[PDB]
Amino acid sequence: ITNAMNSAIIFNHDDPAARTRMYPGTCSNTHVIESVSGDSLAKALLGYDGV
Amino acid sequence: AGSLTQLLATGSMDAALTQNATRTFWKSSYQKHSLFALESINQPFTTQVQFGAESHITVNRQGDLLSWMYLKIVLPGLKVQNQADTVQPTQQSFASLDNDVAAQADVSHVLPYIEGAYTEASLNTKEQLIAEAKNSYEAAKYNAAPLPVAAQMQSTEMPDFDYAYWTEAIGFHLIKRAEFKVGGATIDTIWSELLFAMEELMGRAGRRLTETIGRTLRRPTELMKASRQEQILYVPLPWYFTKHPSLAFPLVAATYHNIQLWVQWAQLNSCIIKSRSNLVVLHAERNVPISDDHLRASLECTYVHLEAAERDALTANAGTQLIVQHQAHLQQVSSNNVTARLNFNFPVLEFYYFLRRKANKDAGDHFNFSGIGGRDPVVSAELLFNNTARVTQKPAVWWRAVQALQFHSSAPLTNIYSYSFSLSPEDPITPSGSANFSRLDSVELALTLQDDFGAAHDANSELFVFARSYNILKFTNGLAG
Amino acid sequence: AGSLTQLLATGSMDAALTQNATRTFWKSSYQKHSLFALESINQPFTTQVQFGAESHITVNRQGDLLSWMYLKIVLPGLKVQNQADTVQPTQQSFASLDNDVAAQADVSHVLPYIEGAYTEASLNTKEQLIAEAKNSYEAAKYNAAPLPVAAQMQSTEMPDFDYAYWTEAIGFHLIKRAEFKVGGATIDTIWSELLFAMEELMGRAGRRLTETIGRTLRRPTELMKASRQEQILYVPLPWYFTKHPSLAFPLVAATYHNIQLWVQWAQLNSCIIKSRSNLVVLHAERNVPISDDHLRASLECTYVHLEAAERDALTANAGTQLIVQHQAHLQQVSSNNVTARLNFNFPVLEFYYFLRRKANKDAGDHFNFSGIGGRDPVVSAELLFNNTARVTQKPAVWWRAVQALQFHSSAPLTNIYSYSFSLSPEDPITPSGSANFSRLDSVELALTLQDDFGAAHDANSELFVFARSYNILKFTNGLAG
Amino acid sequence: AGSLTQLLATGSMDAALTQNATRTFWKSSYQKHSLFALESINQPFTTQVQFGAESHITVNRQGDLLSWMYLKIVLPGLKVQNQADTVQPTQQSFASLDNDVAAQADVSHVLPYIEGAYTEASLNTKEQLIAEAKNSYEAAKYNAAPLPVAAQMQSTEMPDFDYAYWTEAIGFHLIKRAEFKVGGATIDTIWSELLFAMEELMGRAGRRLTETIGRTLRRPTELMKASRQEQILYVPLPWYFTKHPSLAFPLVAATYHNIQLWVQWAQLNSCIIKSRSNLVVLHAERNVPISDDHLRASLECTYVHLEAAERDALTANAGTQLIVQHQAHLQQVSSNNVTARLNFNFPVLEFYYFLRRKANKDAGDHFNFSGIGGRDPVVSAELLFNNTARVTQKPAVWWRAVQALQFHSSAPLTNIYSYSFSLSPEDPITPSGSANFSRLDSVELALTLQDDFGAAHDANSELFVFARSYNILKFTNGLAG
């Protein structure tokens, strides 16, 4: 997903926390993350505080 | 000629009112005050905040006095999804409007008065038979004249869509108990039910806490609208020091004691009502099932900064503050006759009491103190000191409306009853009457409740009695006790 | 640096405000008080209580002072039966909604403006012609723009069943007159119309007497619901001694005088409104025609018990109390120009005035002080002292809204007008202005009323003028006068 | 035995409260006052009163003090006629409900979220697409849960006939600015927007200015009904001397200065809203197009007449009055981040701030301080002194509800925010805190507004900031300054 986002946005999963987090990558200086949407995958990865 | 003659038309009676007059209406006099500033500062809890848990905060020392204190609560927006569409449907149970336990409990009391084939009847016929049986029940129990069946068939226009909402006055309901502690000693304790009763009686017109605590005056459609998005609530904590500037808590005089607020939070299952039993409740932004870790709270404190001369004077001699403390008697009710033994201490200013049906609590209507069919749950009450009537038997309306009219800023919209020994129990600085319960061997509140109160589906209804009492907080050598 | 600099940034002007400051915001000071207790005691009338009769009670001596006083009224629930089904149909006549005398009186004023065949028209056509004639009347009399006919056709959704109800604010209406007597002398007198006017002007937000007096704010459906069962009303009697604890009536200082409350009760025929003219009104529990002996009342008094030292001091020297007494000028109105000659005495603090249409009174709407079509009955008023304008001609809104805004806790919802000579006429202990009417040869209130006020069907409309005046009650050697 | 034992059950702590008691509850004490009388006198303007003009009045010297001051405004009734039926159709443009600029501005923000063929859609389909796009916009911007489309389709039942009405709270809107002048110097200035904000925060329950200023709480049908006939409004001017009798302006002490009220009137085009764009608005009585000369106003002043001894004492030594003056910072808003540089002077008690959308102003809804879609226009605010946070970033609800709860008689129904440095900013005679802005190099109010605030159709939205500051008015040798 990070590679499909051209590393503009970084997705990282923390196995000790069992949590997925999203961070600004290469767009961090130019853009702000306003919102996240998508299908069942986006909801599954991010809808439950990253669980 | 007439206006000058009025000033000359004085006798020996006017001398008691106007001779050597020390005041004029035609010139303002003002007093000079010392320099001070106010600062509002928000502070996080020292422990994690979660539903059903206890959390505490150690209050920072960011000024010389502590004045106002608000619990800032942040609640997420709610969404709902069908359990069949959810990858993890396992959640705590919530009260649901398709399973109205309060309406079912009310129907249970009128079942003996239903004439005809109730079990086999169509839904519309069952509603008619229940409304007719309500008339027969009320005629038999209360000698009530029958209401037209059409006037009892109030359809609450419930929306034809799925929803969940935070319960009425959620800002108070969340605070099951809060304790103000100094040096590890509990100085005062407040309860959710007491906070609501205090707002009903002492809440001033045009300054009601409605939006600040998530209260809609029982309009479910407004609770639904508010619950679709994040809510920020500012719940006032009505400690003795928040009532008047001269009672502000002297932080500088208590330098060697930690000041702590402890809060016991409501369980998440009690905070939410849903349209249907088969819905999962989701956090609206995160799209995950709502969980106990979604409660966020912080403490907003108003500090007072003093000029050095006043700060030094207060540090040298803070002396004593008159304080009001709260006491509670909590009892289960299983009979129409109830005696509450009020083991309260100190000079009691006043007490409040009210009842909650088990069915209203189970329906998530936590501040509905009404009886069966929304009636007054108390028929009469008596107050006894050492088995002698201090207040002889009086009807519910006297304890609810006459006591509120005499001693309070407002009359309660709910079935809250009060009694004052004080002429002005809302004055925080001027004692105006009390009864010393530490010198009474027995204090009994005897209640006659409505028929069938605490029977069947209402077994373990709740009686709340709260008292306000005077005590003294002493400051000496940087300690408070 | 900034907050300390503010405390140092003082000049010669700040010295008048803050030099030698006698108060701090950062330390509470309280005063100690003497020991006292409050007791509420209910007492029966000495004579029988009945509709249309006079009853009295001799107030018991169950404490050292008398503070609050409430008339506890118990009204039976109402039911109705057709006169044809009743074994004894002979009852007093009651106002009925099928014979709306107020609506008929309003129609009578617009009859000259009805164009076309009114007598032969269908009911729906008559309602249209009346609404069009109302526009023509209001255009001709008031230069009013016409309202859409559909906006004037307010159907009050009246229930399609038979009912009777107690009139609006029945707790006040029942008290045609009450007299507080000491030693056989009348100390003060209050009237139903004055009690209502006092609650409109001085009734605090969140402490309105609504439930305590059977007032619904003109919602007939709520009066109907309340009237189906027994009602217990607690009507406050606003005597001088009920207004402040320091004015509590010193029972111990008046030992040789009987204290009496006398009450003249309203006639039963004036207390009830029914859906239809052919209905008999029954006592809901007893299933008998309602009669004059079904009125029940008792007096609820709050006594103060004093410590022996304060009781002995008060017995030795009760001295004098400043009192407010009420005076009344009651006049019939048969013309649009009315002059009321106010033969009041003593230092008058303020007066109230208002009008009642004969048609509103006959319809049983006793506290409806509106004019024709619900308009303001007063166009303008002037106040004259010895034929000199004390207040030049002012419009109704100035006497109703500006005077209430300046001097009262509330603005009246009805057409009650006031004028204050006092800066604070609601302060019971601090005189703040008066006009001495015992030194004026004439006091005239000149009124210009709406067109056709007191004409035709409103011949013998009523003008009420009430004044509040200062006097002194003296206590000496166990006597009061 | 128990009540006497309570009076004997005293210790060393009770001595601080009750030893040498200087007050009793069982005997009234009153103070005598000097003789005075109040007179209300209506006075015409010295210049012509017209819409969009400035007018002044020189206040007459008809007593010794000046107390209350009301602007008495008379507005004609409104009628409408089609432009095609009018012999002279040329009139100023008025806001019209067929051209709702506020609704069009709200739609403009959701246009990017409309999915499908909006341009070619039927009207009912466009309303559906707009409601769905509102859900998508609110989900994207606020993480809001979607509302059912049927709950967003609120039809305001607008009447199916032609009308025009005076805008909400027209009595305040008419007063764009008023200046109280003494000897040619401006003593204080008030603004329409400040008058409304002061009534929202300080307006007491049961004494709201509703009828006196033509305010309906945004019920257009009531504004229409009121606007069909002549309206008489009594707008209170809340000068320092109208707040307490001891601050009454001493006319006798200022004998050599003219006292003037100057009023800048609103433009007629801003005062009226009509059902349709093609209607001409007529004076209802005169049947002519409404014009700028149809505004009528007069000043109603309450004078105080003093006894000669008090008048002579006040003339010899009126001394100094503490006064509150008002200051204003008015700014255009074109971005979601706004910094207001508050160049106010003197000891500031408190400030108010609020925003008005350009679209709300252009729609004639002058007191609608809401954001886009009726939301709160402020997300958060911070207050800085010399680039140091005096109040760190707080959410809108803290500035609106918590500050009002702590310091004001009422919570605002509109998006008015406040902050007090005073413990009691509504006390006109007792200073209870301030910040001296004449000693701060910078005072900045930093605002984060809602998304798209001040963008596109809302370019040049307005920020209002008003401050209340202490000053001293001095009276010497018949002069005031």
Automatic annotation (TrEMBL), chain A:
Protein name: Uncharacterized protein
Part of the whole protein covered: 205 to 255 of 663
TrEMBL record, chains B, C, D:
Native organism: Emiliania huxleyi virus 201
Protein name: Major capsid protein
